[PDB]
Amino acid sequence: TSWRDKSAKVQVKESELPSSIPAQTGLTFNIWYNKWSQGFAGNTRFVSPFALQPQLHSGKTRGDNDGQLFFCLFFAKGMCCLGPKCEYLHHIPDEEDIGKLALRTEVLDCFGREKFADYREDMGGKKNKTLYVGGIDGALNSKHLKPAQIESRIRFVFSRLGDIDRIRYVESKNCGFVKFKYQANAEFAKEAMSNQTLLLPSDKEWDDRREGTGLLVKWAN
Numbered sequence: 001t002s003w004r005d006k007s008a009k010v011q012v013k014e015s016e017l018p019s020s021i022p023a024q025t026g027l028t029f030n031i032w033y034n035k036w037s038q039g040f041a042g043n044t045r046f047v048s049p050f051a052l053q054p055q056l057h058s059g060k061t062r063g064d065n066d067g068q069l070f071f072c073l074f075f076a077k078g079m080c081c082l083g084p085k086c087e088y089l090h091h092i093p094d095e096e097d098i099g100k101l102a103l104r105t106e107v108l109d110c111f112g113r114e115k116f117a118d119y120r121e122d123m124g125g126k127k128n129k130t131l132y133v134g135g136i137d138g139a140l141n142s143k144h145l146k147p148a149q150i151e152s153r154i155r156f157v158f159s160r161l162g163d164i165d166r167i168r169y170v171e172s173k174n175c176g177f178v179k180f181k182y183q184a185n186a187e188f189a190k191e192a193m194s195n196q197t198l199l200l201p202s203d204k205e206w207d208d209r210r211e212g213t214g215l216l217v218k219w220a221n
């Protein structure tokens with residue numbers, strides 16, 4: 001069923017989230033989120049207990065009916081408690097959405113925040129659409145998988161987040177590179193896949209997925 005033909009699913013209960021829930025573009029979002037992350041055990045990047053399931057979760061929100069052009073950051077991370085009440089969009093950014101955003105802004109990402117490029121230090125190397133995906137082995141709890149299997153999992157989880165230009169898994173570096181057709185999908189996928197497991201419900205290790213190390217997802221250089 002098309003996301004257009006349903007209302008967005010509530011992903012978590014508000015009571016599951018830490019208090020002082022911030023606006024996604026708000027002053028304290030990173031303080032709050034970093035605190036959330038640091039609250040987990042132990043030393044490597046936490047494995048988020050929440051995840052976006054695009055087919056299951058995507059749907060209409062009040063945002064769709066209220067002229068909203070920007071996407072819900074909590075939704076991308078699998079942790080929006082609002083569902084159809086949300087005033088931000090709950091679907092995977094598409095060509096239409098992106099066209100409207102282009103008329104609306106040059107300086108904001110798909111979540112309405114300042115684009116990375118406008119404040120980050122350019123280490124050196126025009127619309128970056130490529131993500132570096134690191135710590136693949138750790139996101140699988142060191143499960144013994146082969147490159148064909150590993151590549152299929154990276155492809156599966158990222159391709160459901162937007163049209164893919166190219167994906168590469170690089171065994172020797174324990175990493176992957178995912179290039180989206182559109183910058184908006186890269187922006188969205190980066191937030192969606194950060195700290196995610198790459199285990200699947202069918203894996204023997206699934207119940208112990210928290211004991212891995214969440215994926216590292218950065219802009220590729």
Ligand SMILES: [Zn+2]
Binds near residue numbers: 073
């Ligand atoms: Zn939302």
